[PDB]
Symmetry: C4
Subunit: 388 residues, 4 copies
């Protein structure tokens, strides 16, 4: 019913995730699971049918090299929301571990006045992100429908080019197919982007949790200043005990969200690299502003956009985590107590190796990663231009 | 009238910036703004007219591939002083925040003898840089005029090749156009290079401000040596309080000049990367020492020169900031007081992660950046040589 | 007879190494060496005969470019278990130094309860690794035999294509040659993979030895808490003396296993780089799922697999060594003694520069190395695709 | 006469440098300078004559592309010992500053027993390096003479192909030219390799000076152990005062040898990069083991060999400098005094950012640099192979 913590913070982000069809069966009533567990199986069956009918487009239209690569991208495009659809139930218990990692937070009595200032500050931006991302997908849902109706070639007028046992270019009952594909395209581009935001709202939680843990440092250090009674040294030790055990706890979250989502982040990034080395071939044969250009750009602005969504709040984690060392400096430690000065020396030794999300331990999700991926495309592109 | 700090330090660099036409409306009399605000609007109109007439050169001469790329560079060349012209009023309040960040500096009574030694040392080199850079642009203003008069092809004898509603190859009244383009070329290559120096004089201020903060460390540490009276421990704490709050304040500047100029540094560096992947195509078709070679080199020695201007004093920031850790070592801390020894342990923990100017958080402006950009050109060049 | 330490831990891994034919003459009875030293010489003679007969295949079939590169890889494939066969007796004394580095471990009286918990935990996973790797080679032994019998071209039906003074395509007594090559292929792919696991079990020993040294840190720090008697400060200093001298000792191991195996790791990695720039040429001419594709993939899944075997437990060393700094934090140091707090400040200064295995000081064996090698192949491949 | 320090250590390396013709006029009698200063001018005149006659070979044989690139390398090969010939007198005062940086070393009374153990240990290996390098050049002097006499083409039988106002293919008095070129080739390959060793013996001095400063750390820390009298705390502070002021002094050397030689190291490395992108073109047209192959390999094994000579003892500096942090750990600091424990915390904070030789602040001379240069050649080669 009620939720003991971080689950009560991502309540819009979880209902969408369960509503779109991720096999997320633990944050509502047990007297709703069995009608919902059947819903999740049939959506994946509706996913795997339509995605299965793209291969018979792809395999039968294998004689054209351009229609090979065109259908290759579209099948690799929708290869993300299949893997994330299946990554969630397979790597499942660690997801519930991360969502339940916050259900006993640390708290300090008179100085939680900055806890709730940044607690609800997270919940806005965690809900603000979901309203930005999933709304942009619904925009990109419309942005593939509107391009469908403004071009023809003879081809069947379809949202996604795929074979059917019935007809579409001659059967006028293909309005069933378009509403099927519109449902497919709105469920795929949400069920991928639902799970990505769940990762990307976790890091937004810990970033503002660190941003909380920045601003304690100046009122913490004024406690140890002045020749101190024992009630101060009891209070400043209980102030440190809050601060470190909060900071231990954020590390406990971020090493878990790198453990939960970390392997799927690789499979996401491994897919886009195969995707972008085909977009760059499609980006060669753009002879002008056409319907075709809005399909090459229409993927590349979105397939970079999935990478850019990670690499912002992956960077914002690293930018925030190193910034604690700068913020531990900008307190008046030079007239703190000696137990407070030895506190800062340790903190700046461990806010110095920043918290990064290891993408299955190959790469950290920095924005320099996105600078590397974007640079790798243009390098492969402007080589492939001169090799054309 | 008078200026409370850092604005009084960049007084040559600001008058040139207001004189050339940046919309900088806050460092002179209010009874001069309205004749000056009209001057700034009409210069941008004179910028946008001439730059607008280059597209009608570019779009109408689109059938030639070489004259495509030749006019592409020249339009991308002058795309810098349009963006910096508009970056300043848009991202405006942070510029005035950085220039007013110094108007209450920290000061220590008997040991400001090294403050003014490095205060006026900055003001020389900040004025020495402006006399070097803007003079080199005036040299490069002449260096595009002299090459104009030593070649012809039939073409209109113009400083910058562009269409006009009137004639130049047949109208002998095109001396109006050349004086218009000479004004255009002298205002563009200054209004870009004015704002770049403003960034690049900020870092020169903080570098010599750190170089000041190096040389305090040996006389600071002699205060804590020897068994100390309270008037020493009051004085050495007030010596530390000066040192850290100065060092907090330089960090407060450098995190602001990375916040003020940081996005435009990306747009500058994103433009030159598109520029240098066209210079390298022009660098292929150099069959000998000609007028043409002094146009390919005439851009590449300048377009690298804009990058090299950032990457020196970007590097000099990082070389200076890490050097505080070496200079905090080379004081006699081994016979300082214990509050002085715990001072050095903290300082070397935060002079260890050096202050770098993040170019909109993608890249730091190191000289290794300039080593990477220069290496990326020659790699693209000597691939494009073998692909020709 | 009995073994004083780490040799008694790798007892399956040593008997296989002596059994396969490495010149390892020091961990059994002296009344078994002389029948064993003759065995080691004749196996290398059986290695060098068969490998010598591949050059006369290679040199005589030099007119075909494809059969050049096909036999080039196979000779470069089996160039690993020749070099490792000869690396062991040449660089020999350092191997016995590393295996005898543990024969006087450090021990603390009441807190060795976590020593044997991680001592035998290593010995499982060190024996679990050998049962995985050498079993996978026996799988890959069968995986080159089964592909032999499912293809023909006229060619002699051979496991490895090589010339013989007698005949195989016409002499039906070539069953002697196949049993010779089956012995050759099972001894080569073990005598390389035996020595690799010896390196790769050392790092697994120190990783779980560090994982031991993680978990001391919370019970260590509870000793210094509370106003302490001298018997505590004697005990906490003897607790630190165990911890650092253990940590000095693991460093003493890892700087030795980077000194023992480090040069051969270069020669291994230098060989695969020459190998992978030929696999990528073979990976071009794959026109479909054939017998040929299972030879290109059959090497590339194994030649990357040798690199991937190092780069996991090379990474797991670096991931473990930096993790001590995180684990030295997550003890209650904020109410430890002052001698305990100054302990943590030093430890996090040297768990910060992680222990890495320098591959003859060029490269560290990270998993980012394997990310670089895998990225270098596909880059060379998908350039060579467009240059075909 | 006698020399006050480090000059008395490089006495073989200086006499060779003055003997070969570097304008080094300060380490012998004033009653020998004027006959020696004329010797230095005429050698450079003999250098600039022969090098000047290579351009008239190069410019007149410009119609052949292969003989362009062949003579281009040879002129770029001998472009090193011209620049280093002129780098020494131009950047001169800093060279004498580095050689006189050691003439007042720090010394501690009873614990200089490890000073002279590593003082004379340097002087061996500094003289051992000179006997290795300059002997290898004399080998490479012979290695270009022996290849001269084993090939002909009609061409004049010359050591280095160059024009003369007199004849060589028809004038049998060209034995004067060969003895001139043999003198030229033995003076060029020494006067470059003399100055390189001077840099590369400085780093060898500081490496063994750090290796000295490693081994003090265990006997230093036993002084502070145990409750200490004032004569101990006076002695341990005087032990620290020796250690840091030695370590400050090595930093004072290494920041000077990066300031003295640092710009010429760039010009050396900038030349070889232009050289290696021509060797790789020559490395393409090697059709077999010939006289020609021993000229392509005969430069590439030497032009990499100049880079490899820096990058070993550049790496050995960085490997040694970071190793102080490991060696400051492996003393018994856990029962040192508190002034000794706060010593180690500072040392490991500044042996953590290693001392590197900045090649005019672009690149550090690591062995990863040599790994990058060697990787850049083969990448450019095996691209240029597939583009042939």
């Amino acid at each position: 019913f009620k939720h003991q913590g971080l689950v009560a913070d991502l309540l819009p982000n979880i209902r969408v995730m369960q509503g779109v069809g991720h096999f997320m069966f633990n944050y509502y009533s047990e007297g709703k699971k069995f009608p919902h567990r059947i819903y999740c199986i049939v959506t994946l069956l509706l996913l795997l049918l339509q995605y299965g009918m793209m291969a018979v487009n792809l395999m039968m239209e294998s004689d054209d090299v351009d229609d090979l690569t065109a259908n290759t991208i579209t099948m690799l495009f929708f290869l993300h929301p299949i893997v994330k659809m299946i990554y969630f139930p397979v790597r499942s218990k660690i997801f519930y571990k991360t969502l339940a990692i916050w259900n006993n937070p640390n708290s300090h009595p008179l100085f939680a006045e900055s806890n709730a200032r940044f607690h609800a500050l997270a919940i806005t931006k965690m809900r603000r992100l979901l309203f930005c991302v999933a709304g942009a997908t619904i925009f990109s849902v419309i942005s593939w429908t509107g391009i469908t109706f403004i071009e023809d070639s003879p081809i069947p007028r379809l949202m996604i080019r795929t074979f059917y046992p019935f007809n579409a270019m001659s059967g006028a009952g293909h309005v069933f197919a378009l509403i099927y594909q519109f449902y497919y395209l709105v469920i795929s581009m949400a069920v991928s982007n639902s799970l990505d935001v769940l990762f990307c709202s976790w890091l937004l939680f810990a970033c503002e949790q660190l941003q909380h843990l920045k601003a304690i440092m100046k009122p913490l250090m004024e406690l140890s200043a002045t020749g101190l009674t024992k009630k101060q040294e009891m209070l400043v030790r209980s102030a440190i005990k809050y601060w470190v055990e909060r900071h231990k706890h954020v590390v406990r979250l971020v090493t878990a969200v790198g453990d939960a989502y970390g392997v799927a982040l690789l499979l996401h990034m491994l897919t886009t690299t195969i995707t972008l080395t085909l977009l760059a071939y499609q980006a060669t044969k753009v002879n002008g502003v056409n319907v075709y250009a809005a399909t090459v750009i229409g993927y590349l602005l979105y397939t970079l956009g999935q990478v850019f969504l990670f690499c912002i709040f992956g960077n914002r984690l690293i930018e925030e985590s190193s910034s604690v060392m700068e913020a531990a400096y900008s307190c008046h430690w030079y007239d703190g107590s000696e137990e407070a000065k030895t506190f800062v020396q340790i903190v700046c030794q461990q806010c110095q190796k920043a918290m990064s999300i290891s993408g299955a331990k190959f790469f950290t999700v920095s924005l320099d990663l996105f600078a590397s991926v974007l640079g790798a495309v243009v390098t492969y592109f402007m080589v492939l231009v001169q090799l054309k």
